[PDB]
């Protein structure tokens, strides 16, 4: 799924780099994605100024892969999507199971 078209998707960038890169943004809702090992389960790297123990903190919500017919991608046990892009668009507004509800995309 040519995700290179989107910005949140970034494979050339490592997880460690993903943590610092988002930090550079310095914004609440700053969300990004990173290609994981699984060919069908990337990683949603969500950055938001929070947590008192350590701030800024990077939240990584691995996409739940529930191999169904269809349905497989989801992170909230609420709604399930057959494509990551959908999860990104829906969470971008409305109301989903994100501590900051995607609202600010970041590019690599």
């Amino acid at each position: 799924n040519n995700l290179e078209t989107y910005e949140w998707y970034n494979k050339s960038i490592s997880r460690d780099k993903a943590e610092k890169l988002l930090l550079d943004t310095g914004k609440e809702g700053a969300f990004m994605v990173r290609d994981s090992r699984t060919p069908g389960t990337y990683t949603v790297s969500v950055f938001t100024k929070a947590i008192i123990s350590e701030n800024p903190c990077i939240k990584h919500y691995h996409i739940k892969e529930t191999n169904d017919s269809p349905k497989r991608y989801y992170v909230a046990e609420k709604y399930v999507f057959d494509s990551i892009p959908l999860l990104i668009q829906y969470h971008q507004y409305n109301g989903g199971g994100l501590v900051t509800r995607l609202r600010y995309p970041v590019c690599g």
Partner: protein, 63 residues
């Protein structure tokens, strides 16, 4: 501490937008019912208000 459950507090002034999510408030403390969840961590307000609460805005008091 942390015998079975722990207490959490909202750092900022978060508010609900869905029946499922629970309305919070600064200097507000609750209990922890589901810490296993990575996204929202169930909480129970003394008043009896049960719903999903954020993870980043919440932190275990750790007594």
């Amino acid at each position: 501490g942390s015998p079975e459950e722990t207490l959490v507090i909202a750092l900022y002034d978060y508010q609900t937008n869905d029946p499922q999510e629970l309305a919070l408030r600064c200097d507000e403390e609750y209990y922890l019912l589901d810490s296993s969840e990575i996204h929202w961590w169930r909480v129970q307000d003394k008043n009896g208000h049960e719903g999903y609460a954020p993870s980043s805005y919440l932190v275990e008091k750790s007594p």
